Amino acid sequence: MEMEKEFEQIDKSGSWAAIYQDIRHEASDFPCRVAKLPKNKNRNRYRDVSPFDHSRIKLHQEDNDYINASLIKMEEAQRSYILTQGPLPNTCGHFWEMVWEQKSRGVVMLNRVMEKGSLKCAQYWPQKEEKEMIFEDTNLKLTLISEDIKSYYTVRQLELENLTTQETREILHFHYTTWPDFGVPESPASFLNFLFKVRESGSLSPEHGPVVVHCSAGIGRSGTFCLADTCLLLMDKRKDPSSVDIKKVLLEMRKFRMGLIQTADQLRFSYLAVIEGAKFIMGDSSVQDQWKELSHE
Ligand SMILES: O=C1CN(c2ccccc2)S(=O)(=O)N1
């Protein structure tokens, strides 16, 4: 595959930093006016990470429709994702409101509530079934139905209810717990095992709203996850891994949200995951169980 040759080429000349910095230089620049309004200062976790006005998700409420989230619509691949920051103590209600209004089925969390001794995300979901959460502001109820804890990730079945209409929906929460901030997965096997788990749940299917993906800022780890998934989907459509230009795809994604993929090594890891994942797309069913093994699930 073209990417495989390119990989060795860059790896040989050890120029990932140069390749990565080039993408940053070419990346799109669009207005983030709403995000910067004074009334929204307390709705942003990082002053330097904001959603573009053109692709930001709007909450369905007259008061304030702002939430730090972006709709990444990949027209070519035919899949959309909503990338957002880890919710703040005051935006947990906004977060579930977004999940409801956008009709999402799954939520992918790639960070931990606490990392490097600091709080990177609010405890926005219930940890015990007996203690449901109620969000007054958005009038939503959230209950833990069950959870399947594994070595490095946990899958929870949640029940989201619109207290206004009393409708109920099943939300699946996929939590990757071993992906360090500004870091990379333990191995592509571990990452791919997790991605396919999300895929097998139907959370990424077009019959549901876009899956919600987030880490702390919603650009680094979240970008890596989406880049890998989109690239695998593309070569799957054509059944031709050579037709995928990883850098072009990343640049296309960056038209919807700034700074996707935060380090040169996260870019390098992306190449590894996609090249590895190609094995499955090309008809090798056995590698999935191979990944499950190596992942030390
Ligand atoms: O790897 C990373 C680095 N991130 C980040 C990006 C900007 C500020 C703070 C943290 S992320 O939470 O988007 N994932």
From Swiss-Prot:
Listed GO molecular functions? cadherin binding; enzyme binding; ephrin receptor binding; insulin receptor binding; non-membrane spanning protein tyrosine phosphatase activity; protein kinase binding; protein phosphatase 2A binding; protein tyrosine phosphatase activity
Q: Which UniProt keywords apply?
A: Acetylation, Endoplasmic reticulum, Hydrolase, Membrane, Oxidation, Phosphoprotein, Protein phosphatase, S-nitrosylation
**Which segments cross the bilayer?**
none
**Reaction catalysis annotation:** O-phospho-L-tyrosyl-[protein] + H2O = L-tyrosyl-[protein] + phosphate
Effect upon mutating C215S: Catalytically inactive mutant; abolishes sulfhydration
Cysteine persulfide: modified positions: C215
Query: Crosslink N,N-(cysteine-1,S-diyl)serine (Cys-Ser) sits at which residues?
Result: C215-S216
According to the UniProt entry, which residues carry Cysteine sulfenic acid (-SOH)? C215
- Where does the protein principally reside? endoplasmic reticulum
Q: Which residues carry this modification: Phosphotyrosine?
A: Y20, Y66
Effect in UniProt of substituting D181A: Substrate-trapping mutant
Leader sequence segment: none
Q: EC annotation?
A: 3.1.3.48
GO BP terms in the entry: actin cytoskeleton organization; cellular response to angiotensin; cellular response to fibroblast growth factor stimulus; cellular response to hypoxia; cellular response to nerve growth factor stimulus; cellular response to nitric oxide; cellular response to platelet-derived growth factor stimulus; cellular response to unfolded protein
Membrane protein topology class: Peripheral membrane protein
Modified positions (S-nitrosocysteine) are: C215
Q: How is it modified after translation?
A: Oxidized on Cys-215; the Cys-SOH formed in response to redox signaling reacts with the alpha-amido of the following residue to form a sulfenamide cross-link, triggering a conformational change that inhibits substrate binding and activity. The active site can be restored by reduction.
Describe its partners and assembly state. Interacts with EPHA3 (phosphorylated); dephosphorylates EPHA3 and may regulate its trafficking and function. Interacts with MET. Interacts with NCK1.
Q: What is this protein called?
A: Tyrosine-protein phosphatase non-receptor type 1
- Which species is listed as the source? Homo sapiens (Human)
